[PDB]
Each structure stands twice: as structure tokens, then as C-alpha cells.
Enzyme design. Structure first.
Site: not given
Ligand SMILES: N#Cc1ccc(O)cc1F
Length: 283
Positions: A215, A221
Site C-alpha cells: 500500500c 491495508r
């Protein structure tokens, strides 16, 4: 405790921040001396996100072997992942060198190039078939072969050529395009659908090198993606699926890269994804 009812118990008691802070307190601390050398300052996007020395990916170069990337090796689940930051203008060539050297089939991208009005990673792949990219510092050529745009994600087929040996390989680019600028998604349904598409491609399987997942910093994430995948695989493998403890799996993963799961909202979202995903695997 089991997962789904531990979940409701934390919601009703509103203690997600306290659970998440416990994880932060118990997490491993290992040295990251190579990351902090002065010659590597422009190879790091964030000064407080570094790979540990013991698990960092080394480039096959004698001048400078450093890249901000970590090998997460999950022994019981029999899965490996490389977690890395979004490439910087001066590390796009190193990024593709790593993909080549580690024999990866797939690249998983969980951010947009621009978010919140600022650049979160370099435009590191070509956008038109007839406009290929050449990385002169690492002697690689990258060509867009095809692109399939869907409502929540895009899949691209890419050709990576090692210009020194003229060998070529097909790389799959899985781009989740709808994670919101703030917070986490309301439902895990599209994230799970995306995970299953990566799985179905072969990119996570033992006949290839580890998938590369990123990410912007490569911990938030990105951590959610590998945590959910590993937990669901363990629930399939074990006699007693309710024995899978997501907090223990996350602490194991943090032995290999610092900071995985960046907020209490991301922790709650990981629980939600594993819970719903376990019903679809069988419900
Ligand atoms: N894989 C795996 C794994 C198994 C048990 C545990 O407590 C944590 C883990 F990451």
C-alpha cells in the site's frame, strides 16, 4: 475465546482501542540497522517504517542490496508473503528487480497513486500497451499486455523482460481501487471477493515465489490482506476452526515486519473479514 462472539463482546464493551494497544505493547522489537544507514535515506518513504534486518529482502547487487521490503513466512499455514512500501521515484527499478529475483507471479496493490490530494506511490507500471517502460538502473523492460477494469478492482497482465538474458515472464497486477481515503470499508464483501480472485490466479501458491503486496507504507491495508488470508487458510486446515486466534496470528506476523495493522478500525475490519469469509468458504 471464539472469534465471532469475542467480536460482539468487544463491540458491546467498546474496547477496540484497548485490545489494539495490548497488541502494540506485546509486539516484537528487532533491529533495523541497514534501513537506517545514511546511504538509504532516499530508499525509505517513512522514517518510522523500516524492515527488520533478520527478515529483509536483499537485492542481488553488490553495491547496495537494500529495499524496504520484508519476507513474512507463516509456518503452519504454509504461506509466504513479501510486504513492501509503495515504490518511490528512485526505487521503481529496485522494485521490479525484486519481483524478478524472488520469482513472484503476482503484485497486489491496495492504494491509489494519489489519495487525499498527495502522491502515495510512483506510477510504476505502464498505462498504454504501446508505451512500455525501461528501468535502466536494473536493466528491465515492462510492457502492459491487457487490462480488465471492474467496479472495485482492476487486473492487469504485464510482461517483465530481463534485458541482460532476454528471458521474459508474465506478472499479474491485482489493484484494489476502492479503499476509502479515510477509515475502512463498511462491508468486507468486496475485499474478500478480491482476495479470492488473487487466490484463484495461482499467485499465492507454492509453485511460485512469494506474492508482493503493498500500500503506501506496506503495513496497514497490506497487513489486513495477509492476516485475513492466513486466518482463513488455518480455519480450513485445522480440526477445530474455532481455535484460530487472530490476535496470535497477528503477533506472529509482527515478528517479521513492524506495525502491521495501523489502527483499531483496521483490527476490527480484519475480524469482520475473517468472520464473513469463513461462512462463504463452506455457507
Ligand atoms: N500460521 C500460523 C500460526 C499458528 C499458530 C499461531 O498461534 C500463530 C500463527 F501465526
Amino acid at each position: 475465546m471464539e472469534m465471532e462472539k469475542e467480536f460482539e463482546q468487544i463491540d458491546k464493551s467498546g474496547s477496540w482501542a484497548a485490545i489494539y494497544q495490548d497488541i502494540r505493547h506485546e509486539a516484537s522489537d528487532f533491529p533495523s540497522r541497514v534501513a537506517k544507514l545514511p546511504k538509504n535515506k532516499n530508499r525509505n518513504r517513512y522514517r518510522d517504517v523500516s524492515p527488520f534486518d533478520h527478515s529483509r529482502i536483499k537485492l542481488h547487487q553488490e553495491d547496495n542490496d537494500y529495499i524496504n521490503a520484508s519476507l513474512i513466512k507463516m509456518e503452519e499455514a504454509q504461506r509466504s508473503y513479501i510486504l513492501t512500501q509503495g515504490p518511490l521515484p528512485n526505487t521503481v527499478g529496485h522494485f521490479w528487480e525484486m519481483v524478478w529475483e524472488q520469482k513472484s507471479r503476482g503484485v497486489v496493490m491496495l492504494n491509489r497513486v494519489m489519495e487525499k490530494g498527495s502522491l502515495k506511490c510512483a506510477q510504476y507500471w505502464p498505462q498504454k500497451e504501446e508505451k512500455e517502460m525501461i528501468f535502466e538502473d536494473t536493466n528491465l523492460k515492462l510492457t502492459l499486455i491487457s487490462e480488465d477494469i471492474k467496479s472495485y478492482y482492476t487486473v492487469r497482465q504485464l510482461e517483465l523482460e530481463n534485458l541482460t538474458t532476454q528471458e521474459t515472464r508474465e506478472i499479474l497486477h491485482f489493484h484494489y481501487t476502492t479503499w476509502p481515503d479515510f477509515g475502512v470499508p463498511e462491508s468486507p464483501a468486496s475485499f474478500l471477493n478480491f482476495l479470492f480472485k488473487v487466490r484463484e490466479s495461482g499467485s499465492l501458491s507454492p509453485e511460485h515465489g512469494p506474492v508482493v503486496v503493498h500500500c503506501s507504507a506496506g503495513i496497514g491495508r497490506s497487513g489486513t490482506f495477509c492476516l485475513a488470508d492466513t486466518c482463513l487458510l488455518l480455519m480450513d486446515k485445522r480440526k477445530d476452526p474455532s481455535s484460530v486466534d487472530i490476535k496470535k496470528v497477528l503477533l506472529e506476523m509482527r515478528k517479521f515486519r513492524m506495525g502491521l495493522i495501523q489502527t483499531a478500525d483496521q483490527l476490527r475490519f480484519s475480524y469482520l473479514a475473517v468472520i464473513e469469509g469463513a461462512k462463504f468458504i463452506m455457507g
